[PDB]
Each structure stands twice: as structure tokens, then as C-alpha cells.
Amino acid sequence: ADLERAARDVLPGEIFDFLAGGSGTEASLVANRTALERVFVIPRMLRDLTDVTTEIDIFGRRAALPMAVAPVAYQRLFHPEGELAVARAARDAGVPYTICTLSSVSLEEIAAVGGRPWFQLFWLRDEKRSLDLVRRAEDAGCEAIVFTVDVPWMGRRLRDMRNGFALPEVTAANFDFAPATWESVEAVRAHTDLPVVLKGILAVEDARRAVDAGAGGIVVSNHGGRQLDGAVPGIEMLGEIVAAVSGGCEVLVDGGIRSGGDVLKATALGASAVLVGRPVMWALAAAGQDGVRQLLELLAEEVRDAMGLAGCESVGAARRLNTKLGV
Amino acid sequence: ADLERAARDVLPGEIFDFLAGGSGTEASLVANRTALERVFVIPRMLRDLTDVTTEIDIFGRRAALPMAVAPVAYQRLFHPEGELAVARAARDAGVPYTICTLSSVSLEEIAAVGGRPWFQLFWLRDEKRSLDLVRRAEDAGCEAIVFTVDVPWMGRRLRDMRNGFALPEVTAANFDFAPATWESVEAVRAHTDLPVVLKGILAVEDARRAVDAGAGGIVVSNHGGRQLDGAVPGIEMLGEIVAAVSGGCEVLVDGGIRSGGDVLKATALGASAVLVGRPVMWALAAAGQDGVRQLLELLAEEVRDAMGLAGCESVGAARRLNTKLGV
Amino acid sequence: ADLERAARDVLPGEIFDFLAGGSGTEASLVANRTALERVFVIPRMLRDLTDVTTEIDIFGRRAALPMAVAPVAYQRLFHPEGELAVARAARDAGVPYTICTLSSVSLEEIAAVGGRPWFQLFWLRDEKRSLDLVRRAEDAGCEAIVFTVDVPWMGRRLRDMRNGFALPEVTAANFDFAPATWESVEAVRAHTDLPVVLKGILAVEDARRAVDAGAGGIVVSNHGGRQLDGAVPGIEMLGEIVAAVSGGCEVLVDGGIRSGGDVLKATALGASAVLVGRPVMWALAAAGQDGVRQLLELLAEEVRDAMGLAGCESVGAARRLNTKLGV
Amino acid sequence: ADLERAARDVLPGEIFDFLAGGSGTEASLVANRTALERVFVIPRMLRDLTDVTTEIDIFGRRAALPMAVAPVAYQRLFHPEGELAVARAARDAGVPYTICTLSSVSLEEIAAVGGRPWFQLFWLRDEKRSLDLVRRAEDAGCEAIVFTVDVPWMGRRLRDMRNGFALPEVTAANFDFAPATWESVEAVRAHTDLPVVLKGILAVEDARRAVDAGAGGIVVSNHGGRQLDGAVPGIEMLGEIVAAVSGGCEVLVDGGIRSGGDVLKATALGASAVLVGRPVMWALAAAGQDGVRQLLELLAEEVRDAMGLAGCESVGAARRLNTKLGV
């Protein structure tokens, strides 16, 4: 929330634009926020709140909040401790942390921090390097493979093109790409016992097919407005997708979650959990690990506050809330 | 209307922000106004207006307007005569005045002013102190218990947190809290012969349950945008709630009523009456009792004008008006 | 269109505000324009336009345009020739001119100009003075009684109250008021052979009743936003009212007509004709009779242009156009 | 996109306004853009993209993109090489180029450039000169007659009227007009073996009739907001028209296409192809033939990018995408 100011001041111009930007005219980046702001929660009153809990069970493990840190590449771009600082704060907060394929610190090191790390996979031209990366994540103790499926190639980032931005010095520590298809998903699924989570699903029939394909979860997401410019916001497809999946997998959403109230809105629309991306990096650029820890602490307080004000003692009760679309 | 200027000039910055503010991003505070502005009345023409009357019967008593003063805590924050000045003006205007649990003058004193005072109850951790407070109100001649049900705890007021605002010197004159549940409502109901009015109802099924619970009224209200940020405006739920209650209790609404035309809109959507909060305090900060009296006089004129222009000789006719949603 | 600039420069501040203003917050004044701007016409192509005609038959007489000059009181406030200049220009343009009850020149004089004048009636406390005024209009050769039915009393004009505006010196030349009801309408109807036109109808059932009452026409109108603040715009009720009346009377609309395209939109929504008010007075304040004549000439050109671009050789074809609501 | 800056700087004021302007208040010019911005694409994931192709077959010929250059008159107003520079760049890009009746270079010369030129016909008062112009186009090797049907006469361009704009020196090189009707369309159809394409269709029943009339295509178009001011945008009618035509002719759309994402949106709504008008002239005014070539190259890249991000290996797959309307 606040922190974006501090992030801009301390970060170089091309780095902040890299983090904040979307593709094309940034129509989908802005729409993620406008879609959330149109959602109003209908709160329930007078229910027992003696033991409000924000915990959820997801992928076999208890999480402190219906929330995980979204995969964001090259976190040493924002702070010298990079991914290690975020993973430690996430571990301490009881929240899953998603290790990126393009992390600026190796996945084995991030995983050693503990917590329950997830691993985000970009498909490589080699089915063999891809499946080896999946094996590395699983050997390292990762709890889920978050297969990103909305990047056959990178969308056109006009901020980066204008800046002529390039990665200085930070490296892709996991390395000494190709478009993913449904065959690639089956290959991952056959190669791991970990739940496979498809990130970047927006069509109802792709959500149905993801369940048919054996996915343990999906992330309803337009990649923070960074891929197809003009792609519908995930929050706009979330309710339809939740109904179509009918409990067959976990349904996460991301894009523009900026408060505990937004988490409540996402769960009232039926999400299992949210991912949060840019705000975590603002906290990381502002004050390192302690900055992320404070963000997560504040988010946990706002989620708990919003849930109780809505009459929800549990996240499951929050998913049963009704909503109304407004202006 | 006008008066907000004068209130800001004469009040300290932290006091005005305390009065004007909402929770979080103030999404629900703003939505109360935007929702009302979208409502258009379809007026009726050529009806007898020989004896237009703005009076209503509510909770056994005649009121001059379909309107009461909303509970607003610590009114000595705005003027040295505090609650006593507002209660006198309300009495003289023929309008109910809602005494707050957190009044800066004792409820017995406010009630002595006369009129027909209502008493707003916040549940205390002791069922016994709560029911004693209800008994005090009833012994004092209060006509209704307005049980506030949307504050299990206070919402996060970011204006106050930024200001580091705190109550100076003004005190809670009724004292020498806990979340309310449906059991608390039953306890109040069993302990009083006065009508019990649940303030802060937004879900249709909570309105139905309130009637089943024996409530004599409800106030459809998001607490002026001060509790759940992102809670639907009451005006957006009013019509559905009125249909579901089917005359089983009085249905009041508050939030953003700023004119006689707004009162007409609320009654055309089916409200029995409105509450008005911040405008009454603007009048109180601007010119004390005489300022409130002028506000109520002007409001009575605007309500009467709006009703006649819409072809309504009575508030009941105003409730039968149709509306259209616009931009 | 343009002319409003010239009108403001030459007119006193309180006179321009008197002409431009609406009641209350001017919500309905602004909504008249926003409602029209949301309407999009679906044009037809490739039809014979060899003899495009903007003429209509209304109340037994041919008019050059589907348009009449709206009743606007005290036209000498805007130009020394006042109503006489407007009536002459309307006559020369082939357009009906509505003489006001509060005209600053007597109705017999305005009628002597020729053309086909209509007479707008405000009901007076005396049924006898009212019916005498109707007789004067009919003896004078007026073609229709435009009974204004949305002014039981004047709405609250906040511009005038702020200005402390008052009529200087201009007088009500017809004189040497009370609320109208359906009985008053019957009294007028029984007293005249002229068509009676009810101005200020917004509810579908008042339109039906107007036909049952023997009205020859209605004007769907919120009085240019000058009466009930928050009254629906006429253009928003026009289509429903046209369907309910099912050809039983002429249905005019006014409020915010500012171009030939707006006339086309009104006729595509089903109007028989429009009234135009403030623009005619801008032309009158800017350049007297010649200014009004130019306005009407330009309007006739824009109507003809818009009709041909939409594929309509006649106003009847324009009424059969479809529309789509937009943003 | 960018280029509009460069075009304004290098072009005279009255020439740029001539190119950019619309009729009346420019309501339909702006609505073309607002309508497109409201459309969101629902992308598909994980499909084979090994051979993404932006090619389409239209009017018997393969085109590199689902796109043609829109007819824009008097292109020497923007650059000394005028139409010849645009036609060469279109030929080199594999895109059809529409020769205007009012071209500032003769149609035989433009056609000699090669490519696959289309010819836009304005009906002349002589059926014989009109059909001779059609014969000239067909003898010259044009592939389609684009019969413009939404100009019985020119709409009222207020920018041009204010500027007192007139064609200097540039001439209508095809010459040494009348309103078109359905009889004129039949006359063209009987006189040519080329597909006849009706440009300027907005009503569903005119689209049906165009197919019944033997048209090979239609362009759903409000003429870039330059004809009827208040005409619905083509993009708003496109989906209904596509369903009504049920494959009976090609359905193109134009108006406000400003990116590859906009092309994707148009094809997802069912268009066969788009026309692009003003952007091509911005490129022509900025850098002549090389400027147009770069525009078309960039557009081809953006279309290909948008299609792959949406999971579409072919334009036919893009037409099967779903959309959602937003804010």
C-alpha cells in the first residue's frame, strides 16, 4: 500500500518500471484494479467470532493466510538479499513462497530457508531440462509445481522497450525456453507426485480441462497485466471458473490484491487463496526481510479484521459470502 | 449541505477527520453517495396535495419527518453543549434523537430533554452491564433500543491512525466491549418491552432473521463507510431487504443522506425513515442548538418540497413511487 | 450550441443563471444531457432520399420540423422584443411557438404575429380565471393548450436563492396560482375544443391516464431539471411511455435537445416532436429575431442532415429507427 | 500509435484536423475507441503455437494479415508520393490497399504498383459514369469493389467548417455525386464479376439484405465517426451482424483499430478482417513509404504476438475466442 513510494525513491527508474509495468497500453494492468474496486461484499452480522482464524489447508499443508507470495523473477534487482529475504519473511509469516525459475538465487538455497516453498516452472525447449528442474524442486522439498502456462513468450513491455532495460551484472542462478502445451502439463504430472498448479488460466474451459488434466490447482490470472494486453482480469473470471471446477481443484487468483479487504473480496468470489506480487517487492526494496515481514504482518491483520467485520470466523465462511457489483 | 465548510473551519483537523472519515480506502464511504446519485425518482403528477404531510408513525409514536438523528459518539467533540444541544433541536423539530452508548453526556440527562429519544447499545463483555444499560435507557423513557450489530470491533480508520487521534480531556459519561451475536439480541429482546432495532444489517437473510428474532426494526447501513471497507452501501440493499421483510419490521436506511431529495429516494426504495449522522454534527459544530434546529427546519422544507413535486401527499405514497437507476 | 457564449456575455449574471439553472444540486438538469449522450442511433443505408422531408402533422397542422419552441417565461428578460421576436422567427420557420402564461407580452399580441401558437397554462387558484385564460387563448387563435402539470409549486432554484434574484421593472402581461389535479385537466378539456397537452409527464401510468383523460398529447419532461431534483430525465422514460400510449396521443419530449442529431435520437425513441427551450433564448439574447431565425434555420439543416445520414426520408421513418445504449 | 505526434508536427493544422476529425460533436469518433477499450479477450492457454500464421483468404486471395488499408481520400495531402507510397508499402506487406474514388493519383497508376488493390466507389449522379469507374477498376486488375453506402452526402465536419478548409492546388485524379440505393448496388453487381463489398453497414437487417443483394462482403463501420454523429460504433454491432449473416459474406469492421490487440478483439467479435485508416496516414505523413512499411511491419508483429498470447495459431481460431465487456 504505502511502501510503493519508498520503493520508487530507492529503486532505479528502469527497475521500478520493470516491476510496475504491464504489456501494451497496460489495459489489463489497470483493469485488475478497476475490477476489484467494483466488487462489494455483503457482510453477515452477529455470528460467533470467538476464534476467528485466517488459516487454510492447501496442497496438504496449513497456511497462516489464504495467500502466497507470487513468483517474481530476479528479486536481487530489488534488494541485495533478493529471494532469500522474501522466503525467510514468508516462512516466518506461515505463508507459501513461490520460487521462480528465473530466481537470482538458486532454488535449492531458497528452499533451504524452510517454510513451504512452491516452485514456478517455465517450460524449456528441452522436455529433459524442464523435467530435471521439476526434479530439483521436488528433491529440494518444494510442495507444489506452479506451472506458468500464459507465457509461450514474453508479452511486449513498452516501458522496458522505451528504457532499453536489461539485466545488469543479477543472474538466473538456476542455470549453468519453449511454449508449454497440454502435453507438457501431462509430462510434468507424470514426473512428479507434487500437486501441479497451472498459473495463467482465464477461460472456463481451460479451468475444466486443467482439472481433467490432473492439476491440483489453478491460478486465475492475467499475469498482472504483463502478457496479453486486453486479457480479461482474473477476478472477472473467478466466479465462473469456481462454479465450473466444482471443487475439483484449488482455485487461486492474483492481480491487484492490495489489502486485506481485497483478499476478502477474492475469497467471497470463491478463491481458495490469492497470490500477491508487486507489493511484496515494494516491501523488499523498502526494508529487506523486515520490510516483507511487516507487510505480511499488516496483511494478516487486515485479513483478520475484514473477515470479522464480514461475520466470517473462517476462510470457508468467507467463501460463502455474497457480493454485489457496483460503480 | 453548506455547513460542512463552517464545520471544517471551526473544528480542529483531527476532529473533523474523525467525523468525516471512513475505514480503509473509504470505498464504502464514497459508495454511499455514488449509490444515491444513481437513483432517479419517477414522480407522479396531478394528485391532490391539499394536505401534504411528512409525518410517520414509528415505534408507536408520531414523528414530524421520516427521519431520526443517527447515533454519533462524543458530541462534545463538536460543541460544548454536545448531545444536549442536538437532543433539544431534535425534540423541537419532532424528530427522534438516538442517544449513544458513548455519549459525552449521560443518557438520563439527554433523555430528560424530552422528545422521544432512542438509545443505541454497544454490547459490553458483561451481559449484565449490557442489560443494565438497556434498563437505564428504558427507565429513562427511551422509546427504542437501537442495537448496533456491525461493530464486533472498530474498523480501521486510517485518518485517525495517521493523525494519532485520541479523545482529549470529553468522556464516556455513561460509565463509572464484546462482539454481539444473535444470542445477545435475544437477551436484549427478553429484557425489554421496547422495540429492538438492529443497526448495521446489509444481508437479506440477516434482515429476515432479524424479524424472526423479534426485532421491531432494522437499519440498513454500512455504518457510514466506517466499518468494513468494501461493504455494500445500505441503499443498494434496501429494496431487496424491504421485499424480504414484507412489512414484518420497520426498515430504516442511513449513509449519505444529504437532502430532502435523498430522503425521498430512500423512501421510494421502501425505507420507513432515514438516519442522518454527519450533517447534524456539521450544524452542531457550526452554530450549536440553533444550527441543528435550522438544519432540521431546512430538511423538513426540502422533504415536503420533494414529496409534493413527486405527487405524494404522504410518506406512504412516497414509498409507492418507482425509481430508475441511471448514471 | 455556440450561442451560449454570446448569451452569457451580453446577459446579466443573475439573468443567465435564471435561464441556465436547475433545482437543487441540478442532478436532473445534467442527467438530461447525459441520458441523450448515451443514446446511439442505428442508421439505415441505401434508401431513397430523393425527397427527404422534416415535416410532421401535429394537432391538425403541418409543422416544418418535429419541433416547437418550449414555453419559457418572461422573454423580455433576454431581449427587448422578448416573446414577439421569438414568435416571429418561429412563424417564419414553420415551427409552433408556445406562449407562456407568464409571458412578458400579452398572449393576444403574440398570437397576432400569426404562425400557429400554442398556449401554456399554469393553473390559478380560481378555476374561473384559469378557464378564462384558456378561452382567451382559444379566442386568440391558439392551436393547443399546453397544460403544465409538474408545477404544483416552483422547485427550489439554488442559483436564484444565492443571487437573491427578482424580476426587475418585465411584467406578467397576461394579468391585470394553485396545484393542478386530474379534475383541473377535465375542466380544461370540457371547456375547449383545442387539443390539451399535458407537459411534465414522467410516469408510464400518468401517460396512460392522460390518454384516458382525453389529452391530445403529452410532453415527457422533467421541466429542464427545474422542478424535482432527482426526477428521471424524460428521454429515459420516452420509449416506455410511447409503447404504453400505443398511438393514443402525441408524445413530445424535451430536456437537453441541443442539435439535429438529438432531435433524431428523440424521434428514434418514439417522440412525435421535441420542445427546445434554453437554446432559443440564447439565440434571442444574442441577436434578437434574426438570431432565433438563424438557430431554427441551422436546426432545420441539422435535422435534415441527420435524417438522411440515417436513411430516413420522413420523420415517420426516423421513429422506426433502432437505438443502442452506450457509454 | 506513436506516429500521430510526428504527423501533427509536420502537417498543417487544417490538414491534420481534416484527417483526425469527425462530424458534429465527434460523439461517434470517440465512441469507436471507447467501445474497443471496453472489450476484453478471454485467452486460451497451452495450445500448439508451432506455426502461428496471421494469414487469411479473402475474396479469393491470400492476405498476410486480417487487415486492409482503408480508403482515405486525397493522400497527397499528407505526403508528395501520396497513394503510390501507401500502395507500395501495402503490396510489400501482403495487405490489400483500397484505392479511393477521390484519390490524388489515378486508379490505374495505383493499381500498376501491383499487390491486390481494392477500389472504393462513390456513386455518381450518372449510373453510366459510376459503372464506367467500376469497369476501369476491374480492367486495372482491382480485386474488389468497396461500394461506400453511408455517404448519400458528406456529414457536417465542424473542424473543416471552422478552419474554412479547402483542397489546395491535390486533385481528384480519376476525373476529367448522388446517393446510392439498393438499385445502385444491383447495378454494380450486375456489371462486375468482382466481389462487391458494402462499406458503412450498421443495421443487422442491412447486413442481411446485403447478403441477399449478392454482396461478397460488408464493412461494419460508422465511417470513422465522420458521417452520422451519434451513429453506433461498428464494433458494437459487429457480433450481432456476424451472427445474422451466418457466413453468407465476409464481415469487416473498421473504426479506431490502433494496435494488434485491437485486431484480435475485432476478430474475436467475429470480423473477417479490419480496415485501418488514420494510422496509415500518420505513418505516410511521418516517413512516406518507409513509414507505412514500418507501421505494417509493427502491426504484423503485434497481431502475431496478440494471437499467440491468446492461444490462437490461426485467425480462424481467433474468431472462436470469447470476449467479456468491462469498464
Ligand SMILES: COC(=O)OO[C@@]12Nc3cc(C)c(C)cc3N(C[C@H](O)[C@H](O)[C@H](O)COP(=O)(O)O)C1=NC(=O)NC2=O
Ligand atoms: C518478467 O515476468 C516474467 O519473466 O515472468 O513473470 C513472473 N515474474 C514477474 C516479474 C515481475 C516483475 C512481476 C511484476 C510479475 C511477474 N509475474 C507475475 C506474478 O506472478 C503475478 O501474476 C502478478 O504479479 C500478480 O499481480 P500483482 O503484482 O500482485 O498485482 C510472474 N509470474 C510468473 O508466473 N513468472 C514470473 O517470472
Ligand SMILES: COC(=O)OO[C@@]12Nc3cc(C)c(C)cc3N(C[C@H](O)[C@H](O)[C@H](O)COP(=O)(O)O)C1=NC(=O)NC2=O
Ligand atoms: C466511532 O464510531 C463509533 O464509535 O461507532 O459509530 C457511531 N458513532 C459514529 C461516530 C461518527 C463520528 C460517525 C461519523 C458515525 C458514527 N456512527 C454511524 C452513524 O450512526 C450512521 O450510521 C452514519 O453516520 C450515517 O451516515 P451519514 O453520517 O449520515 O452519512 C455510529 N453508529 C453507531 O451505531 N454507533 C456509533 O457510535
Ligand SMILES: COC(=O)OO[C@@]12Nc3cc(C)c(C)cc3N(C[C@H](O)[C@H](O)[C@H](O)COP(=O)(O)O)C1=NC(=O)NC2=O
Ligand atoms: C421559471 O420556470 C417557470 O416559471 O416555469 O417553467 C417554464 N418557464 C421556463 C423558464 C426558463 C427560464 C426555463 C429554462 C425553462 C422553463 N420551462 C421549461 C421549458 O418549457 C422546457 O421544459 C425546458 O426548458 C426544456 O429543456 P431545455 O431548456 O431545452 O434543455 C417552463 N416550462 C413551463 O411549462 N412553463 C414555464 O414557465
Ligand SMILES: COC(=O)OO[C@@]12Nc3cc(C)c(C)cc3N(C[C@H](O)[C@H](O)[C@H](O)COP(=O)(O)O)C1=NC(=O)NC2=O
Ligand atoms: C472525407 O471523407 C470522404 O470524402 O469519404 O471518406 C473516406 N475518406 C476518408 C478520408 C479521411 C481523411 C478519413 C479519416 C476517413 C475517410 N474514410 C473512412 C475510412 O475509410 C474508414 O472508415 C475510417 O477512417 C476507419 O477508421 P479509422 O481512421 O481507422 O479510425 C473514407 N471512407 C470511404 O469509404 N471513402 C472515403 O473517401
